[PDB]
Design an enzyme around this catalytic site. Structure first.
Site, PDB file in Angstrom:
ATOM      1  N   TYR A  26       0.793  -1.243   0.000  1.00 44.67           N
ATOM      2  CA  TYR A  26       0.000   0.000   0.000  1.00 44.67           C
ATOM      3  C   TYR A  26       0.811   1.271   0.000  1.00 44.67           C
ATOM      4  O   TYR A  26       1.987   1.251   0.373  1.00 44.67           O
ATOM      5  CB  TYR A  26      -0.883   0.057   1.257  1.00 44.67           C
ATOM      6  CG  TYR A  26      -0.120   0.345   2.529  1.00 44.67           C
ATOM      7  CD1 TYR A  26      -0.007   1.649   3.022  1.00 44.67           C
ATOM      8  CD2 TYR A  26       0.492  -0.682   3.256  1.00 44.67           C
ATOM      9  CE1 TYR A  26       0.705   1.931   4.228  1.00 44.67           C
ATOM     10  CE2 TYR A  26       1.204  -0.411   4.442  1.00 44.67           C
ATOM     11  CZ  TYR A  26       1.299   0.892   4.916  1.00 44.67           C
ATOM     12  OH  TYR A  26       2.014   1.154   6.082  1.00 44.67           O
ATOM     13  N   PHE A  36       2.700   9.548   2.379  1.00 42.92           N
ATOM     14  CA  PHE A  36       3.221   9.675   3.735  1.00 42.92           C
ATOM     15  C   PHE A  36       3.709   8.321   4.250  1.00 42.92           C
ATOM     16  O   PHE A  36       4.413   8.259   5.273  1.00 42.92           O
ATOM     17  CB  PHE A  36       2.229  10.309   4.727  1.00 42.92           C
ATOM     18  CG  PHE A  36       0.989   9.510   4.981  1.00 42.92           C
ATOM     19  CD1 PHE A  36      -0.247   9.944   4.515  1.00 42.92           C
ATOM     20  CD2 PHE A  36       1.048   8.326   5.706  1.00 42.92           C
ATOM     21  CE1 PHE A  36      -1.410   9.217   4.760  1.00 42.92           C
ATOM     22  CE2 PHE A  36      -0.110   7.596   5.953  1.00 42.92           C
ATOM     23  CZ  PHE A  36      -1.340   8.049   5.470  1.00 42.92           C
ATOM     24  N   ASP A  37       3.315   7.245   3.571  1.00 41.17           N
ATOM     25  CA  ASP A  37       3.837   5.898   3.907  1.00 41.17           C
ATOM     26  C   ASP A  37       3.721   4.946   2.726  1.00 41.17           C
ATOM     27  O   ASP A  37       2.820   5.056   1.904  1.00 41.17           O
ATOM     28  CB  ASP A  37       3.154   5.259   5.109  1.00 41.17           C
ATOM     29  CG  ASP A  37       3.981   4.104   5.680  1.00 41.17           C
ATOM     30  OD1 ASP A  37       3.390   3.187   6.249  1.00 41.17           O
ATOM     31  OD2 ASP A  37       5.242   4.141   5.583  1.00 41.17           O
ATOM     32  N   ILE A  56      -7.407   0.675  10.730  1.00 39.76           N
ATOM     33  CA  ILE A  56      -8.582   1.545  10.836  1.00 39.76           C
ATOM     34  C   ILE A  56      -9.809   0.961  10.169  1.00 39.76           C
ATOM     35  O   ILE A  56      -9.709   0.047   9.365  1.00 39.76           O
ATOM     36  CB  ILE A  56      -8.270   2.909  10.236  1.00 39.76           C
ATOM     37  CG1 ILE A  56      -7.628   2.754   8.843  1.00 39.76           C
ATOM     38  CG2 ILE A  56      -7.254   3.582  11.132  1.00 39.76           C
ATOM     39  CD1 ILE A  56      -7.535   4.143   8.016  1.00 39.76           C
ATOM     40  N   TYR A  82      -8.754   8.312  11.511  1.00 37.53           N
ATOM     41  CA  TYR A  82      -8.299   8.839  12.807  1.00 37.53           C
ATOM     42  C   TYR A  82      -9.131   9.947  13.454  1.00 37.53           C
ATOM     43  O   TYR A  82      -8.756  10.515  14.502  1.00 37.53           O
ATOM     44  CB  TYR A  82      -6.828   9.252  12.683  1.00 37.53           C
ATOM     45  CG  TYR A  82      -5.932   8.050  12.377  1.00 37.53           C
ATOM     46  CD1 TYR A  82      -5.456   7.833  11.072  1.00 37.53           C
ATOM     47  CD2 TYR A  82      -5.637   7.092  13.361  1.00 37.53           C
ATOM     48  CE1 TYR A  82      -4.711   6.693  10.741  1.00 37.53           C
ATOM     49  CE2 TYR A  82      -4.880   5.915  13.051  1.00 37.53           C
ATOM     50  CZ  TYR A  82      -4.420   5.730  11.712  1.00 37.53           C
ATOM     51  OH  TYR A  82      -3.713   4.609  11.324  1.00 37.53           O
ATOM     52  N   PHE A  99      -5.683   5.627   0.052  1.00 36.79           N
ATOM     53  CA  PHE A  99      -4.676   4.585  -0.034  1.00 36.79           C
ATOM     54  C   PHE A  99      -4.806   3.828  -1.342  1.00 36.79           C
ATOM     55  O   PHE A  99      -5.919   3.571  -1.791  1.00 36.79           O
ATOM     56  CB  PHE A  99      -4.847   3.533   1.085  1.00 36.79           C
ATOM     57  CG  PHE A  99      -4.551   4.027   2.472  1.00 36.79           C
ATOM     58  CD1 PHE A  99      -5.550   4.679   3.244  1.00 36.79           C
ATOM     59  CD2 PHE A  99      -3.327   3.767   3.047  1.00 36.79           C
ATOM     60  CE1 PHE A  99      -5.305   5.051   4.585  1.00 36.79           C
ATOM     61  CE2 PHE A  99      -3.054   4.135   4.389  1.00 36.79           C
ATOM     62  CZ  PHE A  99      -4.028   4.765   5.158  1.00 36.79           C
TER      63      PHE A  99
HETATM   64  C1  SUB Z   1      -8.232   0.566  14.810  1.00 37.89           C
HETATM   65  C2  SUB Z   1      -6.738   1.085  14.476  1.00 37.89           C
HETATM   66  O1  SUB Z   1      -5.395   0.574  13.827  1.00 37.89           O
HETATM   67  C3  SUB Z   1      -4.241   1.373  13.230  1.00 37.89           C
HETATM   68  O2  SUB Z   1      -4.534   2.997  13.287  1.00 37.89           O
HETATM   69  C4  SUB Z   1      -2.881   1.305  12.629  1.00 37.89           C
HETATM   70  C5  SUB Z   1      -1.853   0.578  13.743  1.00 37.89           C
HETATM   71  C6  SUB Z   1      -0.587   0.641  12.827  1.00 37.89           C
HETATM   72  C7  SUB Z   1       0.116   1.908  12.531  1.00 37.89           C
HETATM   73  C8  SUB Z   1       1.318   1.904  11.687  1.00 37.89           C
HETATM   74  C9  SUB Z   1       1.831   0.648  11.137  1.00 37.89           C
HETATM   75  C10 SUB Z   1       1.127  -0.595  11.431  1.00 37.89           C
HETATM   76  C11 SUB Z   1      -0.047  -0.566  12.261  1.00 37.89           C
HETATM   77  N1  SUB Z   1      -2.395   1.932  11.378  1.00 37.89           N
HETATM   78  C12 SUB Z   1      -3.307   1.909  10.242  1.00 37.89           C
HETATM   79  O3  SUB Z   1      -4.589   1.119  10.250  1.00 37.89           O
HETATM   80  C13 SUB Z   1      -3.054   2.505   8.955  1.00 37.89           C
HETATM   81  C14 SUB Z   1      -3.637   1.570   7.643  1.00 37.89           C
HETATM   82  S1  SUB Z   1      -2.873   0.050   7.623  1.00 37.89           S
HETATM   83  C15 SUB Z   1      -1.440   0.570   7.324  1.00 37.89           C
HETATM   84  C16 SUB Z   1      -0.992   1.297   8.552  1.00 37.89           C
HETATM   85  N2  SUB Z   1      -1.512   2.655   8.667  1.00 37.89           N
HETATM   86  S2  SUB Z   1      -1.410   4.265   8.062  1.00 37.89           S
HETATM   87  O4  SUB Z   1      -0.493   3.874   6.938  1.00 37.89           O
HETATM   88  O5  SUB Z   1      -2.591   5.089   8.023  1.00 37.89           O
HETATM   89  C17 SUB Z   1      -0.218   4.794   9.232  1.00 37.89           C
HETATM   90  C18 SUB Z   1       1.172   4.679   8.865  1.00 37.89           C
HETATM   91  C19 SUB Z   1       2.196   5.078   9.787  1.00 37.89           C
HETATM   92  C20 SUB Z   1       1.821   5.605  11.115  1.00 37.89           C
HETATM   93  C21 SUB Z   1       2.859   6.032  12.135  1.00 37.89           C
HETATM   94  C22 SUB Z   1       0.450   5.711  11.453  1.00 37.89           C
HETATM   95  C23 SUB Z   1      -0.580   5.301  10.500  1.00 37.89           C
END
Ligand code: SUB
Length: 107
Positions: A26, A36-37, A56, A82, A99
């Site tokens: 992704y 951003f990632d 999320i 968020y 995404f």
């Molecule tokens: C109910 C909530 O669960 C969560 O908010 C998570 C927990 C997590 C953060 C970073 C890396 C792995 C896991 N992140 C995301 O679901 C989301 C989508 S999946 C990819 C990760 N990320 S993100 O790419 O939006 C993100 C990247 C880096 C940071 C530091 C925070 C968010």
């Protein structure tokens, strides 16, 4: 909520079930379109178990609608990401998230 707009189609028959581990690649962007990632830049797919709420809401619901092999743009409103809180250090309050996600395999 979460909108799914297909980039390239999946098999149209293999959909993730709760309890399975989704393997994906992704890229994430805020409304300005800036990356951003990205799991692609790390050359390592990201994995998560559908239903464990470890991603999320937009991701649980959006990926659940994709079939293996599908690549799609997921547009997620803040309440499905968020919210007013944001993710300090990278996502501000009230952020719609976009995404590019490809569902690679189920494990
Ligand atoms: C109910 C909530 O669960 C969560 O908010 C998570 C927990 C997590 C953060 C970073 C890396 C792995 C896991 N992140 C995301 O679901 C989301 C989508 S999946 C990819 C990760 N990320 S993100 O790419 O939006 C993100 C990247 C880096 C940071 C530091 C925070 C968010």
């Amino acid at each position: 909520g979460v909108q799914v707009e297909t980039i390239s189609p999946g098999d149209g028959r293999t959909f993730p079930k709760r309890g399975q581990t989704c393997v994906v690649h992704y890229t994430g962007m805020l409304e300005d379109g800036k990356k951003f990632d990205s799991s692609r830049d790390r050359n390592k797919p990201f994995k998560f178990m559908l239903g464990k709420q470890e991603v999320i809401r937009g991701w649980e619901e959006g990926v659940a609608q994709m079939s293996v092999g599908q690549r799609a743009k997921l547009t997620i409103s803040p309440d499905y990401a968020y919210g007013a809180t944001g993710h300090p250090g990278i996502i501000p309050p009230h952020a719609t998230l976009v995404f590019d996600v490809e569902l690679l395999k189920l494990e």
